[PDB]
């Protein structure tokens, strides 16, 4: 989850 969001941002 942490990276799914980080990349999206
Ligand atoms: Co990242």
Highlighted features:
de novo protein; 1 helix; Co-MAHF-9 A8M; 9 residues; monomer; binds cobalt (II) ion; monomeric; synthetic construct; mainly alpha
Would you write up a description of this structure?
Helix content is 78%, strand content 0%. The protein is elongated and about 10 Å long. It has one helix and no strands. The protein is an all-alpha fold. The termini are far apart. Bound molecules: cobalt (II) ion. Cobalt (II) ion (CO) binds at residues 3, 6-7. It is classed as de novo protein. Keywords: synthetic construct, DE novo protein.
Summary?
It is classed as de novo protein. With 9 residues, the chain is an all-alpha fold.
Number of helices: 1
What general outline do the C-alpha atoms trace? elongated
Biggest β-sheet strands, sense, barrel:
none
> Structural class per helix/strand content?
mainly alpha
End-to-end separation: 12 Å
Write down the oligomeric state.
Answer: monomer
Series of H and E elements? H
Rg over alpha carbons: 5 Å
Q: Percent helix among the residues?
A: over 70%
Number-wise, the strands total 0
**What ions, cofactors and ligands are bound?**
cobalt (II) ion
Strand content: under 5%
Topology:
Layout: H1 2-8
The chain binds cobalt (II) ion (CO).
Cobalt (II) ion (CO) binds near residues 3, 6 and 7.
């Amino acid at each position: 989850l942490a990276e799914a969001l980080h990349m999206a941002l």
